[PDB]
Symmetry: D2
Subunit: 468 residues, 4 copies
């Protein structure tokens, strides 16, 4: 009973649209929208969406195994050793947002300042003192993107596990010899860095040229959460403003997935005519290339919706009923929807390209979807007085072992790599970017349905130490 | 009665080093050290210092007029119109940390997300609606450093006022014609951008080639706060660890200033032999070139202390009693003092080059000195129930004019450009970087003297919305 | 009767290895090696080869049609209009080395200084005065590689013709409207630049992912010149030094092509055992990535010759009998063959990546293969007294129309875009790079067979004006 | 009897403007204009000039000692050892155009392909075999500008000698220890690279901030060649076209120098009113910043000619009688003089910034002034049958020691570093750029006076090997 089970449970009940019962629904935390900076929904004019892991939520672990298997295969297919084929995806290992150190082949879970919180090498969890040999100040320069990778998104889950599998594998294959920075095999030396590259290449490959999409769209129920309430909310959004899709995915794939998400024997609400997915949007934009989308963008194109091929040249015309865009930029959406940024709420799951960049570069309002938040919330309250015990032991410091021990037992409930948002008392870089960049966040955007359209989402004013 | 008056008042009383009276001293807020992230002083091994506006605090407005006058002069000297000479520095105008928009020649005071809080053009304070013509989403892309300048440090005070003077001047000189982006004068067009460049050039000029230093060191009492307690604290620091100076200033100037700061008829405490300033440091480094200092650095050199000229070539020897370094990097200091970063507390006033970069790039502990914090703290409590009234009006929103009105009356107490750390209920980008990068901060580092050496500076653990 | 006909004619006669008959063979110009800077063959220790259009010479126009057809198809396949399919490759149009101006969609044939010699738009040959509207100083900045493309190699022949086809097509399709910089079609605007990109993408596509290789290797006799003398020369080279292959092509393709080039019922000379192509080389290197190969290179890999896949990691071992390399750099070849540069003769057809860069970056000796030189040499002597007449009319200038007229009649004999090496009296950029970078050059490297191994290739010493 | 003696000899005779006597004057080689590519003077519309070492030719060795002395002094002044003061400039050492290798501290004289022709370390002339330890292929990558410097211009003469002085000095001072790449002195290591930087800094310093200009303009007759014929030629140029000055020098200095060049008790010809230097130009542009001038340029400014200070802002007006420009670009000159490039003849002495870049980037016609060409031409004919003997010994190679010997005796006549344009039979990189970029060249532009205005300067058409 993972987190996509929770979402497909929530998904399976029709909304009681009675006002009283909505207020009580969104009392339970799995259904709350959480506020980081106040936001007056009255003033949002356009709602805009990402697709993958936002509107279309890939069932777990099923989808991650598929990615993993396909990547394992690709790699064996280009000459990595047969033993990889015997690997099998373990959803209890990877937590999202870890940084992969390509110098020493460690997975690292870090705070906002790049302080080490957990360091794993293969599957050996390197303890405090022993990490000082490689990180003498228990810290990593987060900005050194040549060395540190950071696996931010749920697509990175398979690779997160895979990297740990490969490191452990070679550490323990007597054919290879460990070195500080990689493995020797006679006359061939494979550094963790180039190893890591190979994994990245292979994951891209299964996405853009291999069989992930193809295997996905032929078993949508296996891999993709479907929720009656989705058409309802979008329809409700379009009643008070403008609704738009801007997604990195291409049109053809976007079409297969969205069709499915709307495939119900009715429209927004039981008993109404089914209308096609496109009718739910005032502007549809694909091949977005976020985060570049939030800067110079790319040349604006028109999609020929029959073929699914792009028309030839640069689209210079206006927003017409039926048109579909490819590329362009976030200004395209602004000009065309006659919106300036704080007018818009952009809803997506990518902490960097969907959230951080639209806020920083454009002044857009932000809603971050976090799937795991479903499971993480069961664990947070199931185990609440374990945490409250940790809060107590820190406060009594006015014995250190019992801290590090309790912390461990806590993190363990979450997975081998702990909560998404913290390691014991200390918050992760990911938690830290949620609070800082995501104005609102939830386990799923569908949680918006439970708030009235005029709702005022309200966060407490921050005070500086010297102001208290 | 400004803020350097407060510091020279505090400076003028000898420390009562009785333990009880120290605890009570640092109760009053002007003397508190404020904590943003917990820090156990027991574990700091090296204390390191900036000089300008840290150890040597330039008396205000005297020092700022001097800078301003010298810059005004330089500019008239390269052909700017005589009328500039009649300008005169106004300490009630500029607040530090404003961003100068070189496209439209506005001073802008912004929050962490680059939202407009105050916008001034020349001296005309552009109100809400009218700012939308130029900033249609009431926001600026903070990362667009080609366009936006940001005047971060107390050295920037003179230029902050100067830029407003120049814009207002030309707006109203009938010889020139206003344009969106600058001024026409017959066949010459001077954009705000190139205007701004000229000001920057001229300020650098008076610092590196003009008479600022020379006029300063010949009237140190006029321009530089001197405090008996300084030698005392450094001496106390050296008793429990290592003490180091790493400053952007060159040696000669560093020597004149530091000599003065130690010029008392005694040592660390009344009745003891006066020892020279260098004896207070285990490592002295000049020509630091921060923030580059916190990256690749520059080639490490040795200062010939007789001449004050650099020796020829790259210093490869060890830390020797008496040696003075030039350039190098922050690793130089780490290797040589046998320190890893969290061991160190670096104390300085530059929010970017001293604080943000040492934390981000090196994992160094940080103490930010903020002079204005002295005055800003009188105003914060003198006017406390005005603010508490603002907190009330926001909360009653569950009438808008009364918000914007009260906000105004509040900010006005601070200056024309308001508090350093906020504009009414909303925090500035500067406030936001203090909390995020500066582990400790105070009106002056001397506030450290009032805490025991084993003190545990303690900040409350952050919780995410969904965790509460 | 083109130029690959000439080579397959020369190819089809066995070498008379009698010394007297060799001296007389290489008297006729099609068989000469031409010298630009003296070179003592006695001192060359390693001969090194490119493959495509060097050792393996693609029959013309057959190969070019194939490329063209495949590219035309690709483009229609991504949405370019059906009419392209009716195009058909015209070998009498393109001359190699033209520059494509992506601003205005012209093919330009230029001298070393980028002076215009011929300018064609679609198929309209823009005359003198009319070119001044777009090139007011009859010149182009050759270094402006963002704007100017330059189609240098015989692979570029199909695209050279294709670009002219497309420009002419749209100029004259009433569905589109000409503009200075591209074509409007309702709301879509396709600039020549982006048009040009599409063509480039499509040519790469048929090479790396489409069916060019696949269609080629299944009809080698159709597409690839085979010459008994090739194994003979290589064998003769290996008798006096070291022989190496360093090619951009991957191993699999390199294997199919080279096998074929050596597919004869005998070895180097009629009656001897056939030996496999690899035995002819002391070092075999593929995936060369020239010209980067002549700088930092890429990571050195080993080819697993059974699979044709790369082994995993970086090859650190020595040169072993049987080994095949991938990537690396030109230093790899130097270290491993124990050669410094002037020791080596590198033989290839790419004026930039094979010749200019190895000379400039490494001090390697150079032999440039130029296929067209076969046909161009028939034309040069067939029409010799036309040229000698042009030389006369220039000299009598001490009437202008007769110059421009004779020039035309001359260039026409070569093709629509004239000789490779000149336009009337004036030399091309290509000619100019041959003389400057290619130490020796010939219609084919096989011309080396006709010179003794100790031969001294001898060019006249240059004198400066003031020295004569 | 150097080369500036020759020019001041030529300078001192008034021109016999009789047509017959002009034709005979320009028969003698010191007075010839040499042609690299034909040029019809009938078609030049604007003549444009550099100043330093073009119109104003600094007397040698006097000027070079001054530069050298001033640089030596600067360096001792920043801490280089006293012994430098005892150095003294030796005009028989440096030849222009040498490359300084900052890795190993060698002066290198190279051909166009960067082949070594002479290599000196300090003053030790490293012979053939011994150079192979450091340059194993007797070659340098010319494009590696991080390592190789190249001292191109007559201003570089002092530094050329200075670098050799310093290297020799430290090689032989027992206080220092030689290393491959620099010198150790206890704990200080000074690499040749950083040494070289120091020299460069110091030369810039004496030019922009030290006393070179100031000492120069107070003894113009000592340092600057003055020639009656100069006003005559410019006046003659202005009669048939447009005349312009575009110089890197600032206005004030440009004014002192040009005033002097025109300081005669008459105008263009004895007996006419003296007119001021500015009247000789249709466009005057200073602070040119060549070669950037030949690209994006800089912002166009107007000079206030009373003060010599720049007016404030960007000049947008038209070409007005009396106006003086600062910065801008080469398009400024083109637009304003209504010229496209081949219309213009630009006359200057900088092989890169004056000649190579205007030709390559703009299609401008070029005249290169080469002062040394005066002396080099005495030596070329004084010693003609020594060279003709070298030509003979090369040809008889169909004994090697006698080549290298004769070469030596030849080069020696020129200086320690040989002719500017060759080392024995082999041409320098400098010679090679003259022929390739400089359409015309002469010992001085005054040689133009001896050609009629309609003259056709005529170079022989180049033929490729295979065309002969
Ligand atoms: O450059 C980044 C990037 C840089 C730094 C971080 S972070 O330190 O975790 O905030 C995070 C990121 C990213 O998450 C990311 C995602 C996608 C791209 S893309 O290739 O331009 O599309 C670039 C990036
Ligand atoms: O590049 C910056 C800089 C960039 C961005 C900001 S900030 O947005 O206010 O944090 C702030 C800054 C700075 O405060 C600053 C201070 C000194 C230099 S220097 O010329 O490299 O020494 C660069 C900088
Ligand atoms: O950058 C160039 C290039 C630049 C300039 C010229 S040229 O002006 O004709 O000499 C010619 C060229 C080339 O011919 C060429 C061929 C292949 C590459 S690659 O993409 O790096 O492999 C780059 C280049
Ligand atoms: O970048 C160069 C440069 C590069 C290469 C050569 S060359 O190899 O001798 O042709 C020569 C040169 C130069 O002669 C030169 C002169 C002045 C400048 S400046 O600092 O931009 O003004 C740059 C340069
Ligand atoms: Mg997403
Ligand atoms: Mg400071
Ligand atoms: Mg080739
Ligand atoms: Mg010059």
């Amino acid at each position: 009973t993972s987190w996509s089970d929770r979402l497909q449970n929530a998904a399976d009940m029709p909304a009681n649209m009675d006002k009283h019962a909505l207020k009580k629904y969104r009392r339970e935390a799995y259904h709350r929208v959480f506020v980081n900076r106040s936001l007056a929904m009255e003033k949002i004019k356009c709602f805009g969406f990402d697709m993958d892991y936002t509107l279309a939520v890939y069932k777990s672990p099923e989808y991650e195994s598929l990615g993993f298997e396909l990547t394992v295969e690709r790699l064996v297919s280009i000459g990595y050793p047969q033993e990889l084929l015997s690997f099998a995806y373990d959803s209890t290992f990877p937590t999202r947002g870890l940084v992969f150190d390509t110098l020493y082949g460690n997975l690292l879970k870090v705070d906002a300042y790049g302080n080490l919180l957990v360091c794993a090498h293969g599957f050996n969890f390197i303890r405090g003192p022993e990490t000082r040999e490689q990180y003498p100040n228990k810290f990593i320069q987060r900005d050194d993107t040549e060395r540190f990778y950071i696996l931010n998104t749920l697509f990175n889950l398979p690779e997160t596990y895979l990297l740990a599998c490969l490191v452990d594998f070679f550490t323990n294959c007597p054919r290879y010899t460990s070195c500080e920075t990689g493995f020797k095999d006679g006359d061939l030396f494979m550094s963790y860095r180039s190893m890591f590259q190979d994994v990245r290449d292979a994951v891209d490959w299964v996405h853009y040229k291999g069989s992930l999409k193809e295997k996905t769209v032929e078993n949508l129920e296996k891999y993709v959460v479907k929720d009656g309430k989705l058409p309802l909310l979008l329809s409700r959004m379009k009643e008070v403003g403008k609704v738009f899709l801007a997604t990195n995915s291409d049109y053809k794939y976007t079409d297969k997935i969205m069709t499915y998400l709307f495939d119900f024997p009715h429209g927004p609400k039981p008993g109404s005519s089914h209308r096609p997915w496109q009718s739910y949007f005032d502007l549809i934009l694909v091949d977005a290339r976020k985060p570049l989308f939030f800067g110079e963008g790319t040349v604006l194109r028109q999609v020929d919706t029959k073929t699914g091929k792009l028309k030839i040249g640069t689209y210079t015309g206006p927003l017409q009923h039926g048109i579909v865009y490819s590329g362009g930029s976030s200004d395209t959406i602004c000009d065309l929807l006659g919106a300036k940024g704080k007018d818009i709420l952009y809803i997506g799951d990518h902490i960097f390209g969907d959230i951080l960049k639209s806020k920083k570069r454009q002044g857009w309002r932000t809603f971050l979807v976090i799937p795991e938040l479903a499971q993480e919330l069961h664990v947070w309250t199931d185990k609440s007085s374990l945490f409250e015990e940790l809060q107590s032991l820190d406060i009594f410091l006015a014995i250190q072992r019992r801290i590090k021990k309790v912390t461990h037992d806590m993190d363990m409930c979450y997975g081998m790599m702990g909560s998404l948002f913290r390691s014991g008392s200390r918050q992760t870089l990911f938690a830290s970017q949620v609070m800082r960049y995501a104005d609102l966040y939830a386990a799923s955007f569908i949680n918006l349905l439970y708030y009235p359209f005029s709702y005022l989402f309200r966060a407490a004013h921050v005070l500086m130490p010297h102001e208290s």
